[PDB]
Structure 1
Amino acid sequence: ALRGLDTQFLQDNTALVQAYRGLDWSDISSLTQMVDVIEQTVVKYGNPNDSIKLALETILWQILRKYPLLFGFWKRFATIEYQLFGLKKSIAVLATSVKWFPTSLELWCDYLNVLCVNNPNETDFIRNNFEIAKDLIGKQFLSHPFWDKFIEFEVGQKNWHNVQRIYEYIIEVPLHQYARFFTSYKKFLNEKNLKTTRNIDIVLRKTQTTVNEIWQFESKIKQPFFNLGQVLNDDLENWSRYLYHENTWMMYIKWLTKKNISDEVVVDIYQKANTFLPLDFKTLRYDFLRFLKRKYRSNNTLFNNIFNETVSRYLKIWPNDILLMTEYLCMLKRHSFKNSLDQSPKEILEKQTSFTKILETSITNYINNQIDAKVHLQTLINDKNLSIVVVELIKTTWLVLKNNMQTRKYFNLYQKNILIKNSVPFWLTYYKFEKSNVNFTKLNKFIRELGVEIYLPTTVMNDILTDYKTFYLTHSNIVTYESSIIDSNTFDPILYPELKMSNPKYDPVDWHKKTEWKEAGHIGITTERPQISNSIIECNSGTLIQKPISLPNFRNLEKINQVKINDLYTEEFLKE
């Protein structure tokens, strides 16, 4: 967790290789291992990241030096410092050189060229281009840099009008109108950038973050969206995010969805926000799942695989969460077993029976602890999430194949398991089943058992008692009710739900030593209180005169000062 100690260890291990003066293959690989353990743990900001790339380049490991640069681009979007270095290197390269050097240049140009501080990147590619004798290629980069609102735009314009002595103004009109339109936008953008340039100052405050002006800058680049916008708001988000904030991601995704680019761009941004964002946020993630469900209708096959790998990755990190299991299972029933109404009915019924067969072999396989990693459902079952698979099997057996005998056999089998005897959708499905058949014997035996031997959350027990009283009043007569009354439990389905609501532990039918007496006036604090053994205060004074009164017997006279406390808090949580 200690990012400072992870910063300190790499700062200490590098200083052990550097000051022992050896190659130090232990500490060289240890500083590399400390780099790998850090970079997997922390997003590795580019200024810190560059030293790792500089040392590996100093250790001449060319193939590995390229690969750490790709990771750096993912870690920081505004990494023009890492972009230029990756463009400065890989020019000292082999035969694939000329194609790779422009490939990294154009990839950065789609990554960083819309930034105000991007003047060094185009110049370096121009430096690479001027070193070649492709003056046509130098000219193409000149016109593109003219058209984008950059810092030294006027400096670039005049310089390109003197170095290009051979072909300066082949189209005067085209170049200058693009330059002045760039100057109109950069004059506009100068308001926000100078409002940003006068707030960013590291004082461990909100001004170093510039979040107010970054929310101002992102807002004013959203509305005047002259189609550079999607690249610009990407560039605007990139400088604003680098300064973890998921709400900025949600605003960028909302704007980009409103802008209607192709969806695979949005999927790339969603995967990046899935990757670099910390776990437990739980709000952009389900947004990603419902976007994958909504866009499933347009293109079929690849979105099932994006969905499937997403739901597997999200039961990696939130195993206690159950909406993912039923959501996966809804998508499995839609995609893998699909059959419209227009198809002949034996096909339909066989797809339903195939679904029941795979689902039953899945839960029967997992209870008896044998796993089958070829089928993805076998991997996805967790014991918190087993119950919703059993529910899907019940609801499909009963409502689709429509046999009540097999359904009752599954209820009578699975309610004895450990993992699902205290599950909510299993028992509430059981309630809807024994409500569908209108019998009251199983319902009275169910809600008579609902606190003692079927432990449900009190909100669900209150809902079940309220709806069962409402159901019984309208679906049952007095001849059934008066024969339903049995006296050893004093159970009566009209009034017993009205008493059993808020207290679950309710038994329907030596007092001085119970734990309700001892802590009477004050809960939790137990004191044996002094009392007279044979008190006469219930006896009237019309009957005390008939025979003389005995002396009082006392109990607990030693304990008028002793009060004792079972402090669960301190023992089990402060001192562990």
Structure 2
Amino acid sequence: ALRGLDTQFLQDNTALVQAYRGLDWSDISSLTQMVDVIEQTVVKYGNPNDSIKLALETILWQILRKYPLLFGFWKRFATIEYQLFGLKKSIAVLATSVKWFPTSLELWCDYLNVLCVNNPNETDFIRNNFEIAKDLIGKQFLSHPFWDKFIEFEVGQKNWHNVQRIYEYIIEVPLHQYARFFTSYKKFLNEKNLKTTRNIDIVLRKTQTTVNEIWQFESKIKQPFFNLGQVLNDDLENWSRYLYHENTWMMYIKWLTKKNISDEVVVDIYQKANTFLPLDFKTLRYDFLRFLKRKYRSNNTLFNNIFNETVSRYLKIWPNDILLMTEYLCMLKRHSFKNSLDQSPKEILEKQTSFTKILETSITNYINNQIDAKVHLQTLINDKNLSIVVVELIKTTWLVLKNNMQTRKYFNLYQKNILIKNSVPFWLTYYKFEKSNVNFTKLNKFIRELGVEIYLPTTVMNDILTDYKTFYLTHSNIVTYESSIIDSNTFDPILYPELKMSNPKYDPVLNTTANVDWHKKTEWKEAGHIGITTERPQISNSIIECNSGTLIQKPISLPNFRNLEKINQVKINDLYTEEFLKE
């Protein structure tokens, strides 16, 4: 994780290549190895990328230099420096040259050509095509830049109206009108670019980030959805991200839908924004799952396969989260079958019975330690997420097939399994099944065994006991009730749930030996003060229970003490210090 150390490792391996003076083809391949390793952790700034690009160019490996520039560009879109580099290189190419260099200029132009400081890209492009003979392509580039609000746009206008000694203003009207639009927009934007330029300052501070003025800019490019909108809003978001406030991307999520830009432009943002924004934040992540289910309305198998892969990336980064496996198994039921009740009755039941037989043999392999790369469910099935996969088997078998005896058989097998004895959704489905099939005999045994062995959380433990009380009072009668209190144990479905409400380990235990073993328990020792197991002194044969009318018969026996030495001995097992501060 030490980003600072991989920087220092790079700078010293780099300086021992440079100051042992050789290639050190060792020290070269070690610098390239640590630069690959750090890149694969960490998104790198355009200064890091530029130094790497510089060195590979200096040891000249043209095709690998092209691949490294590709990588460079995909972590941090205001890399107009790295585009400009990539364009000066590729202009030393060969025979696909002419159209390769046109390609990276055209791609750089669509990523950075609308940025207030993007003029050097347009100038670079123009230089190249003028260094051909290409008067029509040069004029098209002039005309394009003139219709965008760019910093020295006025100087560029002047330049094109002396350079075009050849046909200057063939249509005076159109070019000077789109320039006039341009310079209106550059004046509007000039307020915001100046409120950016007049804090943007490395102070280890929010002026460095200019985050407040970036938020102001983003808002005023969203609201002004002036069609150059679609590209302007993405450009301002990336220029803001380059100085990791995730609400900037979570404001951009809303703008694309309101503006109405196509599914190809929108999905490539969130695919990129998931990798760009840090792990563990999880706000643009879960929204993107909601988008893919919503964009499925226009049925695309493209949209299916984005969802199957976004889960498989999120499941590895967040393995404990159960929401993901519920969303995945939904789409697996949905996009694999798609019945819609316009079929034969015998056809649809096979589509569910296949969904049983696939799901049944999927869990049997995640418990016997067997992975099948064909079935995509086996790559995702996790011991945190194995529960709900078992649940939906039970939920399909009981509701869809109307099959009880197979359902009840499946409870007995999966009750004793260690991964799913302690599961919220398993037992509540057992609760919902045992509620519907009316019986209380099986259901009373559920709740009396709820703190003792079937270990749910205390917020759910109240949830059954509050609900089961209301249900028992509503559906049962006294004759049902009176036979259920056998009175070996004091258990009663009316009164027991109120007593066992917030207490998990409440036990109705009547005994006379509880009187005998008293004074040696931790409740007695840590009495008025909790945690601290002191040994309180006391008189063994206390007179204070007996009345003064009954004492006068025989004389009072002297006081037998106990534990009288430990009046000052106070012991504490400092469980915080020795297991957290000491590890």
Q: Deviations over 1:383-409 (max 9, x none)?
A: 111110110000100001011111100
The CA deviation at 1:68 is 1.1
Distance across 1 between alignment mates of 2:360 and 2:225? 54
Structure-2 residue corresponding to 1:304 = 304
Kept in 1, the 8 Å contact 2:538–2:561? The answer is yes
Question: Normalising by the residue count of structure 2, what TM-score does the alignment of the two structures yield?
Answer: 0.98
Secondary structure of 2:542's aligned partner: coil
Residue 236 of structure 1: how far off its partner (Å): 1.1
Post-superposition shift, 1:329?
0.4
Q: How far apart, CA to CA, are the structure 2 residues paired with 1:151 and 1:300?
A: 42
Deviations 1:249-290 (A, max 9, x none): 111121111111101111100100111221111111110101
Distance of 2:505 and 2:410 partners within structure 1: 28
Q: Give the C-alpha shift of residue 109 in structure 1.
A: 0.6
Deviation at residue 185 of structure 1 after TM alignment: 0.8
SS at the partner of 2:549? coil
The answer for the alignment partner of 1:446 in structure 2 is 446
Give the CA deviation at 1:335.
0.9
Asked if 2 retains the 8 angstrom alpha-carbon contact of 1:337 and 1:355, the reply is: no
Unpaired runs of 5+ residues, structure 1, are none
Question: Quick check: 1:43–1:276 contact (8 Å CA) kept in 2?
Answer: yes
Q: Tell whether the 8 Å contact from 2:80 to 2:118 is kept in structure 1 after alignment.
A: yes
- In 2, the alpha carbon distance for the partners of 1:434 and 1:424 equals 15
CA contact (8 A) 1:122 1:141 kept: yes
CA distance in 2, matches of 1:218, 1:412: 58
Residue 343 (structure 1) shift:
0.6
Deviation digits for residues 70-128 of structure 1 (CA, Å, limit 9, x no counterpart): 11111111111001000010111010100010100000110001011111100000000
Counterpart Cα distance in 1 of 2:200 and 2:382: 48
Q: 1:17-67 CA distances to partner (integer Å, 9 max, x unpaired)?
A: 110000011111111111011111121110221010000000101111111
Shift of 1:224: 2.2
Contact 1:387 1:426 in 2 (8 A): yes
Task: Summarize deviations over 1:110-160 as a string: whole Å, max 9, x none.
Answer: 000101111110000000010011110000000001000001111100100
What is the 5 A alignment of 1:261-276?
A: 261-276=261-276
Helix, strand or coil for the counterpart of 2:524?
coil
Q: Alpha-carbon deviation of 1:222?
A: 2.0
Task: Write the distance in 2 (CA, Å) between the matches of 1:248 and 1:116.
Answer: 20
**CA offsets, 1:437-467, max 9 Å, x none?**
1000000111010000100001111000010
Render the CA deviation track for 1:495-514: whole Å, top value 9, x for unaligned. Answer: 00010000100111921110
* Superposition deviation, residue 368 in structure 1: 1.7
Q: How many Å separate the matches in 2 of 1:421 and 1:132?
A: 75
Residues 225, 259 of structure 2: 8 Å contact kept: no
For 1:149 and 1:300, how far apart are their aligned partners in 2?
38
Deviation at 1:245, TM superposition (A): 2.1
* Contact residue 339 and residue 348 of structure 1 kept, 8 A: yes
User: In the alignment, is the contact (CA less than 8 A) between 1:484 and 1:492 conserved in 2?
Assistant: yes
Identity across aligned pairs (percent)? 100
What is the rounded CA distance, in whole Å, between the counterparts of 1:172 and 1:300 in structure 2? 47
Q: Return the offset for 1:214.
A: 1.2
- Cα offset, 1:340, TM superposition: 1.7
Deviations 1:209-257 (A, max 9, x none): 1111111122222222221122111111121111132111111121111
Deviates more, 1:215-224 or 1:450-459: 215-224
Secondary structure of the structure 2 residue equivalent to 1:526: coil
| Aligned-partner Cα distance in 1 for 2:108–2:209 | 25
Residues in 2 aligned to 1:368 and 1:225: alpha-carbon distance in whole angstroms: 57
2:320/2:384 contact within 8 Å kept: yes
- The 5 A counterparts of 1:6-405 are 6-405=6-405
* Alignment partners' CA distance in 2, 1:224 and 1:285: 27
Secondary structure in structure 1 of the residue aligned to 2:525:
coil
SS in 1 for 2:523: coil
| Whole-angstrom distance in 2 between the partners of 1:259 and 1:363 | 45
Q: Distance in 2 between matches of 1:342 and 1:5?
A: 63
C-alpha distance after superposition, 1:353-410 (max 9, x if no partner): 1101101011112222222111111221111111101100001000010111111000
Are the counterparts in 1 of residues 532 and 571 from structure 2 also a CA contact under 8 Å? Answer: yes
Secondary structure of 2:201's aligned partner: coil
Q: 1:179: how far off? A: 1.1
Q: CA shift at 1:488, angstroms?
A: 2.1
SS across alignment from 1:76: coil
Instruction: Indicate how the Cα distance of structure 1 residues 371 and 222 shifts in structure 2: closer, same or farther if over 3 A, else same.
Output: closer
Measure the CA separation in 2 of the matches of 1:448 and 1:564.
37
Contact kept, 8 Å, 1:218 with 1:237, in 2: the verdict is yes
Farther-moved stretch of structure 1 (36-45 vs 508-517): 508-517
Of the structure 1 ranges 540-549 and 255-264, higher mean CA displacement relative to structure 2 is found in 255-264
In 2, distance between residues paired with 1:523 and 1:486? 37
- Mean CA deviation greater in 526-535 or 216-225: 216-225
Point out the more displaced range, 405-414 or 333-342. 333-342
Farther off after superposition, 6-15 or 426-435: 6-15
Structure 2 stretches lacking a partner, 5+ long: 509-515
Looking at structure 2, the residues matched to 103 and 76 of structure 1 have their Cα atoms a distance apart, in angstroms, of 20
Whether contact under 8 Å (2:246, 2:277) holds in the other structure is yes
CA positional deviation for 1:557 = 0.9
Contact 2:540 2:560 in 1 (8 A): yes
Comparing 244-253 and 450-459, the one that deviates more? 244-253
CA shift digits 1:538-575 (9 cap, x unpaired)? 00000110010010000011100100011111111111
Are 1:524 and 2:531 matched, yes or no?
yes
Q: Secondary structure at the residue paired with 2:55?
A: helix
CA distance in 2: counterparts of 1:88 and 1:299, whole angstroms: 43
Aligned-partner Cα distance in 2 for 1:415–1:259: 52
Tell me the secondary structure at the aligned position of residue 337 of structure 2.
coil
Query: Cα offset for 1:299?
Result: 2.7
Most deviating of 187-196 and 452-461: 187-196
Q: Distance in 2 between matches of 1:201 and 1:491?
A: 71
Contact 2:526 2:532 in 1 (8 A): yes
Deviations 1:171-220 (A, max 9, x none): 11111111111111111111111121111121111111111111112222
2:542 is equivalent to residue 535 of structure 1: yes
- Residue 330 of structure 1: CA displacement? 0.6
Pick which of 530-539 and 270-279 moved more: 270-279
Deviates more, 1:98-107 or 1:42-51: 42-51
Residues 469-501 of structure 1 deviation map (CA, whole Å, 9 limit, x = unaligned): 000001101111010002122100010001000
Whether the 8 Å CA contact 2:17–2:24 is kept in 1: the answer is yes
Which residue is equivalent to 2:513? none
Q: 2:289·2:307 contact (CA, 8 Å) conserved in 1?
A: yes
Q: Distance in 2 between matches of 1:129 and 1:368?
A: 66
8 Å contact from structure 1 (residues 532, 555) kept in 2: yes
